[PDB]
Design a protein around this nucleic acid. Structure first.
Ligand SMILES: [K+]
Ligand SMILES: [K+]
Ligand SMILES: [K+]
Ligand SMILES: [Mg+2]
Ligand SMILES: [Mg+2]
Ligand SMILES: [Mg+2]
Ligand SMILES: [Mg+2]
Ligand SMILES: [Mg+2]
Ligand SMILES: [Mg+2]
Ligand SMILES: [Mg+2]
Ligand SMILES: [Mg+2]
Ligand SMILES: [Mg+2]
Ligand SMILES: [Mg+2]
Ligand SMILES: [Mg+2]
Ligand SMILES: [Mg+2]
Ligand SMILES: [Mg+2]
Ligand SMILES: [Mg+2]
Ligand SMILES: [Mg+2]
Ligand SMILES: [Mg+2]
Ligand SMILES: [Mg+2]
Ligand SMILES: [Mg+2]
Ligand SMILES: [Mg+2]
Ligand SMILES: [Mg+2]
Ligand SMILES: [Mg+2]
Ligand SMILES: [Mg+2]
Ligand SMILES: [Mg+2]
Ligand SMILES: [Mg+2]
Ligand SMILES: [Mg+2]
Ligand SMILES: [Mg+2]
Ligand SMILES: [Mg+2]
Ligand SMILES: [Mg+2]
Ligand SMILES: [Mg+2]
Ligand SMILES: [Mg+2]
Ligand SMILES: [Mg+2]
Ligand SMILES: [Mg+2]
Ligand SMILES: [Mg+2]
Ligand SMILES: [Mg+2]
Ligand SMILES: [Mg+2]
Ligand SMILES: [Mg+2]
Ligand SMILES: [Mg+2]
Ligand SMILES: [Mg+2]
Ligand SMILES: [Mg+2]
Ligand SMILES: [Mg+2]
Ligand SMILES: [Mg+2]
Ligand SMILES: [Mg+2]
Ligand SMILES: [Mg+2]
Lengths: 205, 151, 82, 86, 80
RNA sequence: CCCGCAGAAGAAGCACCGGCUAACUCCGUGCCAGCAGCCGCGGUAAUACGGAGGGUGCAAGCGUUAAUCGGAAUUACUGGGC
RNA sequence: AAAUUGAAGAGUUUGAUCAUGGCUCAGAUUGAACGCUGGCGGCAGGCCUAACACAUGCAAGUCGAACGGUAACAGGAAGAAGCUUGCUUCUUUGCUGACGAGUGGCGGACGGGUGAGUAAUGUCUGGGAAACUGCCUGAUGGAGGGGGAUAACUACUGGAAACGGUAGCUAAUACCGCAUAACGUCGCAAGACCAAAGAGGGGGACCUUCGGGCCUCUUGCCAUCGGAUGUGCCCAGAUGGGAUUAGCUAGUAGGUGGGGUAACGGCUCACCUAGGCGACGAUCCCUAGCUGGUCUGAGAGGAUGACCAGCCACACUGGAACUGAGACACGGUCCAGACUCCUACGGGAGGCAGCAGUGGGGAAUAUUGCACAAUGGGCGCAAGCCUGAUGCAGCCAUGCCGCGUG
């Protein structure tokens, strides 16, 4: 299952933008971010250590749209691999098809990218893959079908992705509406707002 | 007994239909029983002269169970009551053996028999099993049984 | 007697046969002396279809073993290939 | 029994049984006679009994009624005894 | 070439038979303290040449007798 | 396994919110009815009982119980004392 | 290159403190059960309790190329008879294809099920000598000649039945002699002894009674030494609790001689010795199928043996033996016991812990399904037949896993 409910409430709880909206309007014009949801959202209670670790984990999980068990499997796989586990799991989450195809600029929201994917609108290496949680390999080539190449939402997506910051390990051609995922990033290319240590100490109890 | 029989089309829905029917029936029967019990517990505070006889009944067919229970319950009198604990169709099994052994009752087999499992508990327990094959003799003996309790 | 027979492995609608030297009196998946190779009637063209150790086959046949039909046809096909 | 083959097998097993009984009976009769001669002490009679017995064990072992080793043991022990006598 | 074990005589009372203790010295599984265990065996000897207090050499053989499956090879040192 | 048809159209519940332990306010009773893993709530100011609004965690599942190990260095060889 | 990178605490005794010490909670996991709720798909799993008792259907056959044979169906033949003169009843013929019953060969000792029993009669590991083994394979040879029975069948004849009894009654790779006998057996040697079976396919010439002889090919049978495989036997170590279970043992421990087994052995008997085991735990009582592994744990460890695979034991309970290469035998035989059923009361029949399924017990666990298309197994030269093994399907949120409800 997925989270089908209101979206800005997640940001309000977490206290920071999660990019769960298109961006046509600034987030502040839509909601009062500083106040937490609920009637008692004005108050700011104490948050214990376990609380802050849980909040960090929840932030990551909500930002990448993953349910609990899948996240547990990701953590286990990262622990099994070599190197710093935070780096590996960050690579793992970014290896999903939804995050990549959104990051290539073919959609407005990760939800929109996932809805495109589940409807057999994309190929990798010329093979149609509808499974959202598919993991991509380096030098793989991603493209959209000609059948759904006419979608106006994709067209506007190709434009609104422009004002965002563009990645370094990816190459995208709006001319052929396709992309190449040259190599997997490390921790460095991602936001410093993500504290992996709290997640590590949380799960490793 | 007497329920209407119909052929149905599909498989999965029949189980749910039957279970839904069972739930409401259970609800209603428990409702009547506990309504009576709650209403009349404190009314039962007074006492009087009453002769109660408890029986547990095993009969061969459904209609036979109905008939025997009906006869015994209609035979009840204001001061002489034949309160059947519970009856069912089939053989006399350990549930009936330990049920009759628990309460002050008797196992009566009408055109049915006992089984080894109930048999062991009965011989260890000294519970009384009464065997009859004719309705008339059964009524006669039970009538004697209740009429002997008086005074 | 000892014979070379096919033992089924894998999953439903996904057969994978081991090539086994075993007593005929044991079950299909029962005890056996030596595993020799494998066959896969489903594998795609980009993957090896079959593999057998021919030397051991020769050794056991010389010892006195016997061959089933499918195994015999398999040896015929592999000898044709190489 | 229940199966046809079971009945037929029992029927023929009975026959095999009485035939084996007869042949084994002859076998023991002969060994008893040679043992009695051995206890008697007459070397000529002992040798004669040994020679009339000798073909019989070999024939019966040939047909499989008694394994070869049992006949060999019997003959070897009996000749050992006859040499004990003389 | 023949596997052979060396042991101490403890019983020459039996006719054409002797009893020998084989002492083995091994560690404990979990505690690690080295213990000294013993095995008693019945050995066949044909001239009753052994004596109590000797130390001898024995080897495996067919079941020459019940509870008698080892045979004397050579008397290593004598008692007294 | 593939292609076509129509329509957002045929499809979300469970437990918890006094501390341990992530998440609070009012109404109804008044050591009663009740809760409870432990400390312990309830005698008219109940974030602990019942209802409601809000929130937290899981999800085609959610809880309770049964059972083994861990926490237990609480049988201590690694690793306890008189 | 690679095949490990592993370790958290909190509440609770007192006016307050430190310590000691018990209790409770946070995590994983299950053959799970119950409550509320419930869309799809993929893989797996599903009587843990009464080794309680079972209705019914199926679960072990095959070979006419071993044999006497026609019980059925078909083809041919005389032409029976008919007869529309070239179409159809009965008139038959083992004549042909085949094949009910029967003898004979191989197989039911494998595959499947269960864990009642066993503290070793088991298992795990590493060694060992005194053993056998059908079907498979290597070598050397052999394969001459006879004899008397029986089923089937025929005619009778008991019993309620199960099942019988008598007489005639025919053959074979069924049975039994004789010849021949070494590299086999026994024996120091000398010596003495031991076996058998044919069938089918095709055919020139020749014999020829066309009975087939005769030629050739294939496959069967006998003996002996080998290989591969299975099984039997022995040794050391390891394999629960109870010392409020301290002594146990007289074929018992040895030895000589007979006997027995495929094999060694108190395996069995006669006699002689007086021994043997036990605090390094005997004997006795309770409990228990074992292992490769599974769960947990940082590790050492603890608990456990559902599924898969190897080993053991059991088939209503107790006892015994035959047949057989191999059993002291789930769907074989005999005896005793209980229980269920049939009866003319004179006597008889039965064994799901095999696949479905029923009753009962329990908190709790399913379809009286399709097919031999594939793997594997038995029989055959082969075609082929059999297979509730196995392949696939049906029911169940029991679990892992992926997807949607925009
Ligand atoms: K019988
Ligand atoms: K002959
Ligand atoms: K919907
Ligand atoms: Mg899921
Ligand atoms: Mg097996
Ligand atoms: Mg024979
Ligand atoms: Mg050592
Ligand atoms: Mg909090
Ligand atoms: Mg509550
Ligand atoms: Mg207090
Ligand atoms: Mg109030
Ligand atoms: Mg309330
Ligand atoms: Mg609420
Ligand atoms: Mg620990
Ligand atoms: Mg510990
Ligand atoms: Mg202490
Ligand atoms: Mg699909
Ligand atoms: Mg014929
Ligand atoms: Mg005819
Ligand atoms: Mg036939
Ligand atoms: Mg059998
Ligand atoms: Mg069972
Ligand atoms: Mg060994
Ligand atoms: Mg006669
Ligand atoms: Mg004749
Ligand atoms: Mg013969
Ligand atoms: Mg000679
Ligand atoms: Mg001869
Ligand atoms: Mg154990
Ligand atoms: Mg004696
Ligand atoms: Mg002797
Ligand atoms: Mg047991
Ligand atoms: Mg681990
Ligand atoms: Mg361990
Ligand atoms: Mg088991
Ligand atoms: Mg039974
Ligand atoms: Mg028995
Ligand atoms: Mg035999
Ligand atoms: Mg047995
Ligand atoms: Mg059976
Ligand atoms: Mg009987
Ligand atoms: Mg069954
Ligand atoms: Mg029940
Ligand atoms: Mg086949
Ligand atoms: Mg059949
Ligand atoms: Mg499902």
């Amino acid at each position: 299952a997925r989270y089908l409910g209101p979206k800005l409430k997640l940001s309000r709880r977490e206290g920071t933008d999660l990019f769960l909206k298109s961006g046509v309007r600034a987030i502040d014009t839509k909601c009062k971010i500083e106040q937490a949801p609920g009637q008692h959202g004005a108050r700011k209670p104490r948050l214990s250590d376990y609380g802050v670790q849980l909040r960090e984990k929840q932030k990551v999980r909500r930002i990448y749209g993953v349910l609990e068990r899948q996240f547990r499997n990701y953590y286990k796989e990262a622990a099994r691999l070599k190197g710093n586990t935070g780096e590996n799991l960050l690579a793992l989450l970014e290896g999903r098809l939804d995050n990549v195809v959104y990051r290539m600029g073919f959609g407005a929201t990760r939800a929109e990218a996932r809805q495109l994917v589940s409807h057999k609108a994309i190929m990798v290496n010329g093979r149609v893959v509808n499974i959202a949680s598919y993991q991509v390999s380096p030098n793989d080539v991603v493209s959209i079908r000609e059948k759904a190449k006419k979608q106006s939402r994709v067209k506007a997506a190709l434009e609104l992705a422009e004002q965002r910051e563009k990645p370094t390990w990816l190459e995208v051609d709006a001319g052929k509406m396709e992309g190449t995922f040259k190599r997997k990033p490390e921790r460095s290319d991602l936001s410093a707002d993500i504290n992996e240590h709290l997640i590590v100490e949380l799960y490793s109890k | 007994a007497g329920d209407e029989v119909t052929v149905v089309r599909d498989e999965k829905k029949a189980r749910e239909v039957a279970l839904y029917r069972q739930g409401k029936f259970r609800e209603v029967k428990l409702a009547r029983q506990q309504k009576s019990k709650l209403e009349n517990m404190f009314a039962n505070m007074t006492e009087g002269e009453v002769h109660e006889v408890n029986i547990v009944l095993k009969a061969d067919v459904q209609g036979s169970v109905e008939a025997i229970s009906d006869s015994l319950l209609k035979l009840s009198t204001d001061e002489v009551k034949v309160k059947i604990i519970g009856s069912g169709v089939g053989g006399i099994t350990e549930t009936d053996a330990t049920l009759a052994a628990a309460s002050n009752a008797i196992l009566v087999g009408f055109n049915v028999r006992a089984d080894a499992s109930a048999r062991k508990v009965i011989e260890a327990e000294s519970l009384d099993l009464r065997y009859y094959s004719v309705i008339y003799n059964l009524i006669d003996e039970v009538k004697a049984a209740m009429s002997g309790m008086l005074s | 007697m000892v014979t070379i027979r096919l033992a089924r492995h894998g999953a439903k609608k996904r057969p994978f046969y081991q090539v086994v030297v075993a007593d005929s009196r044991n079950a299909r998946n029962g005890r056996f002396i030596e595993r020799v190779g494998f066959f896969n009637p489903i594998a795609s063209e980009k993957e090896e279809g079959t593999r057998l150790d021919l030397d051991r086959i020769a050794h056991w046949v010389g010892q006195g073993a016997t061959i089933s039909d499918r195994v015999a046809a398999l040896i015929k096909e592999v000898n044709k290939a190489a | 029994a229940n199966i046809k083959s079971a009945k037929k097998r029992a029927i023929q097993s009975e026959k095999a049984r009485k035939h084996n009984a007869s042949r084994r009976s002859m076998m023991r009769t002969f060994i008893k006679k040679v043992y009695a001669a051995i206890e008697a002490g007459d070397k000529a009679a002992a040798q004669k009994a040994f020679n009339e017995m000798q073909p019989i064990v070999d024939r019966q072992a040939a047909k499989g009624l008694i394994h070869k080793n049992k006949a060999a043991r019997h003959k070897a022990n009996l000749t050992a005894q006859i040499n004990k006598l003389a | 070439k023949i596997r052979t074990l060396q042991g101490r005589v403890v019983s020459d009372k039996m006719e054409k038979s002797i009893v020998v203790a084989i002492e083995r010295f091994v560690k404990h599984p979990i505690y690690g303290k080295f213990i000294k265990r013993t095995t008693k065996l019945h050995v066949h000897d044909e001239n009753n040449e052994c004596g109590i207090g000797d130390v001898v050499e024995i080897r495996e053989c067919r079941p020459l007798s019940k509870t008698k499956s080892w045979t004397l090879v050579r008397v290593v040192e004598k008692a007294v």
